[PDB]
Amino acid sequence: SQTLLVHGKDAQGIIKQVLSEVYDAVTSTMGPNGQLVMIKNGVSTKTTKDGVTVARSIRFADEAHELVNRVITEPATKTDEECGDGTTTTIMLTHALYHLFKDFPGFQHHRNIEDLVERVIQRLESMAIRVEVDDPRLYQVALTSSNQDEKLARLVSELYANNKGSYPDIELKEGVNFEDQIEQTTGRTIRMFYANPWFAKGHQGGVTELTGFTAFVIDRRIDKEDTQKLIDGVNHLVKTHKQHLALPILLIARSFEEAANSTLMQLNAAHPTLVEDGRPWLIPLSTPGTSELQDIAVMLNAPMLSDVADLTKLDTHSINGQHGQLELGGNRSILKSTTPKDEDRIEQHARGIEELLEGFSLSDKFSVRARYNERRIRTLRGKLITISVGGETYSEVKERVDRYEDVVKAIRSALENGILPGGGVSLVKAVFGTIKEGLEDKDQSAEFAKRYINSGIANELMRLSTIQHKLLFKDTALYKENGSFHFNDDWLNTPTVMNLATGEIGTPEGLGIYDTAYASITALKGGLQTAKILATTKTLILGEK
Amino acid sequence: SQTLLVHGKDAQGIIKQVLSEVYDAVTSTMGPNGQLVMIKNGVSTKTTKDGVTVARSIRFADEAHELVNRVITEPATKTDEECGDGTTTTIMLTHALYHLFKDFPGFQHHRNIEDLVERVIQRLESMAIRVEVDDPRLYQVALTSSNQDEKLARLVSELYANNKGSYPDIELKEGVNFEDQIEQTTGRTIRMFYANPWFAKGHQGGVTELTGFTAFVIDRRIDKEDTQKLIDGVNHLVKTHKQHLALPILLIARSFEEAANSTLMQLNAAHPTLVEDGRPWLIPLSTPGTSELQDIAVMLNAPMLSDVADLTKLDTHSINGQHGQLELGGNRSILKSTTPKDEDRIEQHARGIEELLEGFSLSDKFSVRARYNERRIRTLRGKLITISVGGETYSEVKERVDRYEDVVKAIRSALENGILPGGGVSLVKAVFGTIKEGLEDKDQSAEFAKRYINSGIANELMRLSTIQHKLLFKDTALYKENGSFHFNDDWLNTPTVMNLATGEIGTPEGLGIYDTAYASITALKGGLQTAKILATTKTLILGEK
Amino acid sequence: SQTLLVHGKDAQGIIKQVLSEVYDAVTSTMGPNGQLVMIKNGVSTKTTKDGVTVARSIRFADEAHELVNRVITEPATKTDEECGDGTTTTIMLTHALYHLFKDFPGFQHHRNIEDLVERVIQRLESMAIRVEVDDPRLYQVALTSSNQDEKLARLVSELYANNKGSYPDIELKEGVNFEDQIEQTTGRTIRMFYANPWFAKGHQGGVTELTGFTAFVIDRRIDKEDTQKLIDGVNHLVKTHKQHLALPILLIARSFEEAANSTLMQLNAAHPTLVEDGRPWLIPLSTPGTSELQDIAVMLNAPMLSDVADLTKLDTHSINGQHGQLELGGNRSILKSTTPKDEDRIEQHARGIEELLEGFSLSDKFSVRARYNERRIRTLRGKLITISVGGETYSEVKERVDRYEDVVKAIRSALENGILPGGGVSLVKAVFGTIKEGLEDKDQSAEFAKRYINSGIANELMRLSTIQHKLLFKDTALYKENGSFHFNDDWLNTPTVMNLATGEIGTPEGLGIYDTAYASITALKGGLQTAKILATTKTLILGEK
Amino acid sequence: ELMRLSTIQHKLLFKDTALYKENGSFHFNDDWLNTPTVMNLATGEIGTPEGLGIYDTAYASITALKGGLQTAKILATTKTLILGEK
Numbered sequence A, B, C: 001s002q003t004l005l006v007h008g009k010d011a012q013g014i015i016k017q018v019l020s021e022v023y024d025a026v027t028s029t030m031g032p033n034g035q036l037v038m039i040k041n042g043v044s045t046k047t048t049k050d051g052v053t054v055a056r057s058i059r060f061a062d063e064a065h066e067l068v069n070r071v072i073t074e075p076a077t078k079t080d081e082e083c084g085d086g087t088t089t090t091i092m093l094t095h096a097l098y099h100l101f102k103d104f105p106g107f108q109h110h111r112n113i114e115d116l117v118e119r120v121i122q123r124l125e126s127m128a129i130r131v132e133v134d135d136p137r138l139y140q141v142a143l144t145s146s147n148q149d150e151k152l153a154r155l156v157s158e159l160y161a162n163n164k165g166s167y168p169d170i171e172l173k174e175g176v177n178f179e180d181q182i183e184q185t186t187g188r189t190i191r192m193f194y195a196n197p198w199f200a201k202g203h204q205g206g207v208t209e210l211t212g213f214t215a216f217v218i219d220r221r222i223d224k225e226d227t228q229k230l231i232d233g234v235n236h237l238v239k240t241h242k243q244h245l246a247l248p249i250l251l252i253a254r255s256f257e258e259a260a261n262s263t264l265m266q267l268n269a270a271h272p273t274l275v276e277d278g279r280p281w282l283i284p285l286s287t288p289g290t291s292e293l294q295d296i297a298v299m300l301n302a303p304m305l306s307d308v309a310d311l312t313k314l315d316t317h318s319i320n321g322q323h324g325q326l327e328l329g330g331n332r333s334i335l336k337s338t339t340p341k342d343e344d345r346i347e348q349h350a351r352g353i354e355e356l357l358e359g360f361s362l363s364d365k366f367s368v369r370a371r372y373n374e375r376r377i378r379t380l381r382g383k384l385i386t387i388s389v390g391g392e393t394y395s396e397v398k399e400r401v402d403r404y405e406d407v408v409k410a411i412r413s414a415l416e417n418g419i420l421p422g423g424g425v426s427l428v429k430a431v432f433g434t435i436k437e438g439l440e441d442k443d444q445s446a447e448f449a450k451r452y453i454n455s456g457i458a459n460e461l462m463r464l465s466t467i468q469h470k471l472l473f474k475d476t477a478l479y480k481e482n483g484s485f486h487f488n489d490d491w492l493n494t495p496t497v498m499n500l501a502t503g504e505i506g507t508p509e510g511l512g513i514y515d516t517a518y519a520s521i522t523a524l525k526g527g528l529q530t531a532k533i534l535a536t537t538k539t540l541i542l543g544e545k
Numbered sequence D: 001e002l003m004r005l006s007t008i009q010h011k012l013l014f015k016d017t018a019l020y021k022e023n024g025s026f027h028f029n030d031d032w033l034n035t036p037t038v039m040n041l042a043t044g045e046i047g048t049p050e051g052l053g054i055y056d057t058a059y060a061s062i063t064a065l066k067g068g069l070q071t072a073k074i075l076a077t078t079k080t081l082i083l084g085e086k
C-alpha cells in the first residue's frame, strides 16, 4: 500500500516478473517426467504434478503481483472446467506469445500477429482426426490420460466398443469392495426433480416409482402471481378431462417458488378420491437453454406450454397420458420402460437436432452452441452406466474415481472432436504449414511476405511452436545428438518424438501419444488473447474504493 | 581489491556490462548526425564526435572493468594507426558478434560461426572496387572523409589527377599565412640520416648539400667490435682506389653506435688533404625490413655489403661514384638530380618489386607484406610535394593540417585498395550473398543447411549486418514509412540509403558515400576475434604479483 | 569521482543546471540598475557589476559542472578581449537560444533554426549605422560606456573631433597629479625593438636617438644557421657600398636568436673606425601577419628581403639610407621627422591597403582580415597621443586609466564599425523584420511558412528577441501600464525605451543609448554556436588519463 | 497559446502514426482547415472525419469545454487547502 497507482515501465516489469514465475512453477510439471510441487494447506502437504492444481493454488505476497497472476491463472483453470486437460500448455504459450508481442511493437504489428496465429488456429482445426468407438486408438488415448493404467483403459474402451450404436453415459459412485462393479441400464437420466419434499412417496423426499403418468411442460418461473392460473388449470383437467388421464399429473416447469408449492399441496387435499397409497396425484418438478425442457416434453408425450393459463384451453388432441415407467427423485428423475411407439418420436426428435449440426460451420462445431446440442442428443439417446469404484482404503478409492472421470472426459471428447498427434508436434506442423501455404500461393504472397516473413514474425513464430517439443525432450536421448535439433523437411514429413514412459523413439502416431483436439486449440486460442492483454496493459490500480 | 580472482557467472556479467557501456558511448558518435562527447583533461574540455578519441579516452573505476575495456579498445585504436578510419564500426560489430556467439553455445557452434563469417569476409574482399587517379569519385571519397570540405577535396584530388603517371608523396607543415602554399618537387625522400652531428657542414648537424659522392651500403649494426674493420676498409679505398672516387664517401648502415662514430672522426683527421670547405669526406648514415637498405643501394649506385670486412675486397667493378646531387639531413636525406642512366636502374628495380605483387594471392594483397613492398615502390618512384597549411589562428591551422592528413590517408588507401558502397550496405549485401551462394550451390547445400541455416545462425547473422544501417538511419525519413524496414530482393539489387548531410534519398553509388575497402574488412576481421575472446573468457585476475 | 562517464538524461540535466545558474548570476548585473556581486580572492572583496569579471570568476564544486561552465564562459570572456563590451548579453542569449533548440528537436529543425538566425544576423549587419568624428553622437556613445562621466566623454570626443583628417592613436600612463596631462605628437609608433640590450646607447638597453640610418628588412627567423650569411652580408655593404650609407645599419627581422646576436657584436668590433660616441653601427631589431614588416619597410625606405644571403646582391637602386629622425627603444621604436618625400610613399602604400577593403564583401568587413588591415593603416597614418591619467589616490588613478581605455575601445569601434540603437531594441526590429521580409516576398513564402512560421519557430524566436528588453525594463515605469507589453507595429516604427540613468521615456535615438555594432553581432553569432553545442551534447567525461 | 491547445486532442490521437510521421510534426495550414485530414484508428486509412465516418455528439465536446474552463480556473485560482476535521 505504498502506491495504489502503477504506470508504465513499472507495470510491465511486474507483469514480466509474475508471468516468468508462474511459467517456471507450472512448466516444471509438464509430462510424465515432470518434477513435483509440494503444497501446504493449513496442516498438511499435497505433493503433485497436476499443473492445474499447482496453478490454481500458487499464491503471492504483493497485491500487484496477485492482481496479474489471477489474469494468467483463471484462463488456464477455465480450460479444465470444460475440456478436462490442457492448462500447463496454455500457460507455456501465454509466455511464448507474450514474449513475441513484445518483440514487435507498433499497433499495426500486433494486428498482424493476431491474424497469423488465427490462420494457424484454423490449420489446427483442419488437422483434426476422427475416431469411432471400434478403433484401437481410443485405448491409447485412454492409456495416455490414465497416466499408464493397463487395467482402466481396457475396461472403459470395452464399454464404448461393446455398445457400438449407442453412446454410453457414465456415472461414478465410491464403492465398498476391493473390486469394481458395473451396472448397465437401457434408460436415460432426466434433469427434473421435486420442487418440495412433500410431493414424494411417504411425503418426505423419497424415491416415488410409477407405472403411469400424464406430464405437462410449463416454461415460466412460478411464484405468488401464478397461484390462480394453477387452481383454474388443475380443476379444469380433473373435472372435464378425467376420463383420459393416468395419475399422477406431473407439472414440469423451470422453478417452483414456495407460494405456488403450498397452493398445489391444498389442491391435492381438494380431491382425496384420487389418492392411491399416499402418492399425491400432482407433482411439481423443477430443472436448472429453454429447449432442454423441450427434450423433457418429447420423452414423456407432454405438450409444450408457454403460460400457466394455457392449462385451461386443452383437449384429447393436446392431453396424452403415458403408461410407461418412471422413477422420480430429489436429485434427478429416471425413465426406464419405453414403448417402441415413443422410441420413434424421440429418435425423430434427435434426428432433428443432428440435422441442425450437419449444416453448421466447422468453426461453430467447436462452439458451446453445438456442444450443448450434443448434450441434448445424449440425454435423448444413450445407455446409462453406473460404475461403483473400489480399492484397498478410503483415499485410494476417491483418487481412483477421479482417475476414471479423467478417462471418460478424455474418451468422450476424443470421439466427439477427434485427436491430434502428441509430443508438441501438431503445433509445429501447423505453423510450418501455415507459413508455407500463404508463401506458396502465388496470389497473395505479395503482401504475405511483406507482413509476416519480411518483418521477421514468421521466423519468430516458428521458433515458438518448438517450445513444447523443447521442454518435453531437452536433456534426453533425442536431443543429445547434433548439439540442438534440426527441424528440416524430413522431420515435418515423419516427426520423431520420445515416449517418456518407455524410452523408445518413433512417431507420435506409432508410439501412441495423442492430445484431444479441443484442448491444444483452446490452449492456443486462450494463449493469444491472454498474451495480448498482458502485453498491451500499461496500468495497475490497487485502491480499495 | 575485494577479490582478485573472478570466476564464471560473474566474469561474463562484467564483460557484458563494460562492452555495453563502451558501445553506447562510442556508437552515439557514428556518422555526421552523431551526438557529442565532452572530455576532461585536467583543466580543459575537448568536445568531440571522433569515436577513436572517445574510445581511447574512456576510462573506468574498478580494475576489473578496465581490464576488459582495454581489450575492447586497443583493437579499435589499432585500426586508425594503420588504416586511418573505422574504429566505431569495429566496436559496434564487437558487440554484434559477441551477442551472437552467446546465442549459440557449444564448441562446435563457435567453430561454425567463424567459418561462416570468414566466408563473408572473402565476399567483402571480392566486392572491392578500383579507382584510377583520373576518376571523379576520388573527389567524393575525399569529400566524405573531409567532413564536407568543398575546398580541400578539390585541391588534393587535383594533385593526384594532374600527376597521372606518378603517385605523389605528400608532407605537411604548419604555415604562416591565411592561404595555403604548395611546393612541388621531382625528387624522392630517403630514410637515411646522420649518425653524429659532427659529420655535417659546419660540424654541428646542419644540412650538407652535395654535387658528387660515392655511397656504400653496409647491413650489420656497428659498435666497438667493428672499429678495426673500418680502419682496414677506409684506408684501403683512400690509398688503392682514390683515382675513381668522388668525395664524400658515404657509409650507409643500420646503426652507428658511439664507439665506431669516434673512430671515423679520427679517420677524417687522418687524411686532411681530402677536406674541402670543412665538409668531412666520410659520413656514417643510420636508418630505422632489410630490403629498405637495398632501395637506398639502388638509388645511389652503391653496392650491397653483408660484413664490414668486405670493404677491403673491392674493385672498379664494385665501386661506383655518382655525380648527381644530394641533400643530407639530420631527420632525412633528399635526392634531386638523377641522370637518366640511373632512372633506368631504379625503374628496373621497381618493376622487380611490382612483379612480386602481380603473383600474390588476393588475401595476401591486403597483408603487411604487400603494403610494405608498395611503400618501397613509392620511395623508389614518385613526386615529393610539400604543402604548408595556414589559417586565421594557431589551433585552426593545426586542426586544418590534421584534416589534410585524413584526406591523404583516405585517398592513398582509396586508389591503393579500392572502395566499397557506403551507409552500411556493403556488409548487408555480403551476408545475404554468402548465404545465397552456399545454399544455391547444389554440391554442398547438403551440409550448408545443416550447419548454418538449420541451426538458425544464418538468420541471426543476417539481422546483424543490418545494425550499421539501423543505427545510421533509425529515426529518419527512410525508416518512418512501413513501421521498420523491408530488406527484400528489390532492395538488394538497388540499395537505398539517406545522405545525412543533404537529406535526399538514393543509392550510395548515386549520392557519393564510400568506405575504404581496408577499413570495413579490418573492422569485421577484428570484430570477430575480439568478439570471440570476450565470449570464451571465463576468468579475471587482478592480483599484482 | 563517483562516475567519470555521464550519458544522456543526466548530462543535459547538468548542462541545464549550470547554464541556469550562470545566467542568474550574470544577468542580475545587466545595465546601470543591475545589482552587485561580491567576490573573494584570498583575503579581500571585489564588489562589482562587471558581468565579464563576474563570469570569468564564477566557480563551481563538481568537476562536471565546471566542465560545462568553462564552455559557457570562455566565449563571453572572448568577446571583451577583442571587442571591449558585450559578455552578459552573449550569455543571456546563450540561454535564450538553448532553450529554443530544446523546444524543437529533430535534426532537420536545428538546421532550420540556424538558417533563420543566420538571416537575422545579416539583418543586423545591414542595420549598421555610421559615424564621422565630427558627429555629436560619439559623445553620447562615450557617455554610455564611461558609466555617465561628463568630464571624460567631453575630452576624448574633442580629441577625435579636433584632428578631423587623422585618426588619433592613444596610449595611457599612470600619472602623478590630481589633474590629467595630454601629450600630442605627429609621429607613429613602430612595433620594432632591440634583439639584445648591448646594441643600444651605453651598451645596456637604453633609448638611442638617431638623426640618420639605413634600414634593411629581413623576413626569416635568424639563429645559428644564419651566422655566415650575416658576415658575408655586413662586410659586403661596409666594404663595397660604404659611400652611399648613413650609420647605423638597422637589420630589422622577425626574431634574432642568441647565436646570431653574438656574431653581430663581433662584426661591430670588426670595424671600430665607424663607431661614433659608443653607438654601434649595426642594430638587430625583432618584431612579434608577414605584411606588418612590409609596413616597417615602407616607413623607412628599406627594401624587403626574403633570405639573409640576399644582403650580398645589392646596388644603389636597392640601398637607400634615410636622413630623418628615429628613436629606438627596448619596448618599441618611434619615428618623428618625416621629409614630405617619404609621406608621399607611405600615403601611397596606405591607399593600396584601403583599396583592398573597398572591394571586400560586407560580411568580410567584420572579419579579422579587414581589422588587421585597418590596424596596418593606423600604424602607417595617424597621430600618437600620450595621456597621463591622475587623481587623488593610487587605486582611483589605476581605475580611471581603465575607464579611459574603455572609452577609446568604444570610440574606435564606434566610428570603425558604426553603432546600433540601444535598450535591446535593435535585436527585436531585426527579428520582426527578418520574419516580415521572407513572409512578404511572394517568391519563397511557399517554403518560408512551411519551415519557420508553420512549425512555430518564428513565433518562438520573436518572443526571444524581447528578452533583453524585458530584463532591462521589467519592474519599471514603462512596463507597469497594460499588464505586460504590446510589441505592435506602432512600436516597431517608433520604439520606446527607458533611460535607466535619468528615468525619462523616449527612443534610444532620442535619449542617446547606443551599442557598438560589432558587439551585439558577435554576441548573437557567439550565442548561436554555443547554444547549439550545449543542446546537442549528450556526454561528459571526467577521467584523468 | 489557445491555438496550440486545440491541437492537443489531435496530437494525442495521432502522434506516433502514419499521419504524423511525414514532415517532422504537423502543419495546420489554411489548406488543412478547409479539408481536415485525420486517421481512422480502426482501419488505418486516411481522410476527412466526414468521409471516414467519425463523429462526436455536439452536447459532449461542448460540455467538455464548458466544464474544462470552470474547473481549470478553479484549480488555477486556488491558493489554499484545509484538511482539518472539525
Ligand SMILES: Nc1ncnc2c1ncn2[C@@H]1O[C@H](COP(=O)(O)OP(=O)(O)O)[C@@H](O)[C@H]1O
Pocket (backbone or CB within 6 Å): A029, A030, A031, A032, A051, A052, A085, A086, A087, A088, A089, A090, A144, A422, A423, A424, A472, A498, A499, A500, A501, A513, A514, A515
Ligand atoms: N507418455 C508420453 N510420451 C510422450 N509425450 C507425452 C506423454 N505423455 C504426455 N506427453 C506430452 O506432454 C504433454 C502432457 O502434459 P500434461 O501436464 O498432461 O498437460 P496439461 O496439464 O496441459 O493437460 C502433452 O502435450 C503430450 O503431448
Ligand SMILES: Nc1ncnc2c1ncn2[C@@H]1O[C@H](COP(=O)(O)OP(=O)(O)O)[C@@H](O)[C@H]1O
Pocket (backbone or CB within 6 Å): B029, B030, B031, B032, B051, B052, B085, B086, B087, B088, B089, B090, B144, B422, B423, B424, B472, B498, B499, B500, B501, B513, B514, B515
Ligand atoms: N554523409 C553521409 N551520408 C550517409 N552515410 C554516411 C555519411 N558519412 C558517413 N556515413 C556512414 O557512416 C559511417 C561513418 O562513421 P565514422 O564515425 O566516420 O566511422 P569510423 O569512426 O568508424 O571511421 C560510415 O560507415 C558511412 O557509411
Ligand SMILES: Nc1ncnc2c1ncn2[C@@H]1O[C@H](COP(=O)(O)OP(=O)(O)O)[C@@H](O)[C@H]1O
Pocket (backbone or CB within 6 Å): C029, C030, C031, C032, C051, C052, C085, C086, C087, C088, C089, C090, C144, C422, C423, C424, C472, C498, C499, C500, C501, C513, C514, C515
Ligand atoms: N543608461 C542606459 N539607459 C538605457 N539602457 C541602457 C543604459 N545603459 C545600458 N543600457 C542597455 O543595457 C545593456 C548594458 O549592459 P552591460 O552590462 O554594459 O552589457 P555587457 O556587459 O554585455 O557589455 C545594453 O544592452 C544597453 O542597451
